[PDB]
């Protein structure tokens, strides 16, 4: 059972601009996703302070990076708070808590898209490098769900029949054919060192066999 949704107009416009831009500094997508993971880890850590049982679904707070040359995918996995079905639809489908309109105004005025995270929409920088993004998520209070979009104005959500996660979020970037450099461990390592060295949660790069 698959449900289809439309992006809010402003989000569709943002995705269109990102998807199509010749913006060369594409490596920033990774720090944005890592930053989101860190934020979600902050969220579960915070809740756990007053309700320890929230970590029954897993005590480890970490971020894993998983390149897959065979599938041409780069996966970012965290054990953060995850998202309920409602959270998932709202966070990805709407302006939600972000400064999306101010960002679009700033872009029109010639701002650098590296500022995207400052406007609370860093996730969409994934489309600099990905033709399709899948987001699998598990929150303590809901089932495991899979969100996906290849842009073009719509996304889908379905209950995930994949491998169960205890709790957290997995972002699967289905890379553009010209963007396979982000499957190279040496490339990933350097991007993490440049832009994510002061994230306090452990970030582990899984080197391909
Ligand atoms: C949005 C992307 C897909 C994403 C989300 C979560 C997630 N799991 N539980 C959460 O609350 N978040 C989260 C974190 C940050 C966010 C939002 C919304 C706006 N910002 C800035 C949501 C994640 O762990 C990794 C990710 O890449």
From Swiss-Prot:
GO term, biological process aspect, one: cellular response to heat
Effect of residue 32 to A: Strong ATP-binding. Strong interaction with HSF1, HIF1A, ERBB2, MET, KEAP1 and RHOBTB2. No effect on interaction with TSC1
One GO CC term on file: axonal growth cone
Entry's Gene Ontology molecular function annotations: ATP binding; ATP hydrolysis activity; ATP-dependent protein folding chaperone; CTP binding; dATP binding; disordered domain specific binding; DNA polymerase binding; enzyme-substrate adaptor activity
N6-acetyllysine: residues bearing it: 43, 69
Region called Interaction with NR3C1, residue ranges: 1-209
Keyword hit for Cell membrane: yes
Effect upon mutating residue 78 to A: Impaired ATP-binding. Strong interaction with HIF1A, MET, KEAP1 and RHOBTB2. Loss of interaction with HSF1 and ERBB2. Los of interaction with TSC1
Localization in the cell: Nucleus; Cytoplasm; Melanosome; Cell membrane
Nucleus as UniProt keyword: yes
Primary role: Molecular chaperone that promotes the maturation, structural maintenance and proper regulation of specific target proteins involved for instance in cell cycle control and signal transduction. Undergoes a functional cycle that is linked to its ATPase activity which is essential for its chaperone activity. This cycle probably induces conformational changes in the client proteins, thereby causing their activation. Interacts dynamically with various co-chaperones that modulate its substrate recognition, ATPase cycle and chaperone function.
Record text on subunit structure and interactions: Homodimer. Identified in NR3C1/GCR steroid receptor-chaperone complexes formed at least by NR3C1, HSP90AA1 and a variety of proteins containing TPR repeats such as FKBP4, FKBP5, PPID, PPP5C or STIP1. Forms a complex containing HSP90AA1, TSC1 and TSC2; TSC1 is required to recruit TCS2 to the complex. The closed form interacts (via the middle domain and TPR repeat-binding motif) with co-chaperone TSC1 (via C-terminus). Interacts with TOM34. Interacts with TERT; the interaction, together with PTGES3, is required for correct assembly and stabilization of the TERT holoenzyme complex.
Membership in a protein family: Belongs to the heat shock protein 90 family.
Name by which UniProt lists this protein: Heat shock protein HSP 90-alpha
Natural source organism: Homo sapiens (Human)
Gene name in the database record: HSP90AA1
């Amino acid at each position: 059972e698959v449900e289809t949704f439309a992006f809010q107009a402003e989000i569709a416009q943002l995705m269109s601009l990102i998807i199509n831009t010749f913006y060369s500094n594409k490596e920033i997508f990774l720090r944005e996703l890592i930053s989101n993971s860190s934020d979600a880890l902050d969220k579960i850590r915070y809740e756990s302070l007053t309700d320890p049982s929230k970590l029954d679904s897993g005590k480890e707070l970490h971020i894993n990076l998983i390149p897959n040359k065979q599938d041409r995918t780069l996966t970012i996995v965290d054990t953060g708070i995850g998202m309920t079905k409602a959270d998932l639809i709202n966070n990805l489908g709407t302006i939600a808590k972000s400064g999306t309109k101010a960002f679009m105004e700033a872009l029109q005025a010639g701002a650098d898209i590296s500022m995207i995270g400052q406007f609370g929409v860093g996730f969409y920088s994934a489309y600099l490098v990905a033709e399709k993004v899948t987001v699998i998520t598990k929150h303590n209070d809901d089932e495991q769900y899979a969100w996906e979009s290849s842009a073009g104005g719509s996304f889908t959500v379905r209950t995930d029949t994949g491998e169960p996660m205890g709790r957290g979020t997995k972002v699967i970037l289905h890379l553009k054919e010209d963007q396979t450099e982000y499957l190279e461990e040496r490339r990933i390592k350097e991007i993490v060192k440049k832009h994510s060295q002061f994230i306090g949660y452990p970030i582990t790069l899984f080197v391909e066999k």
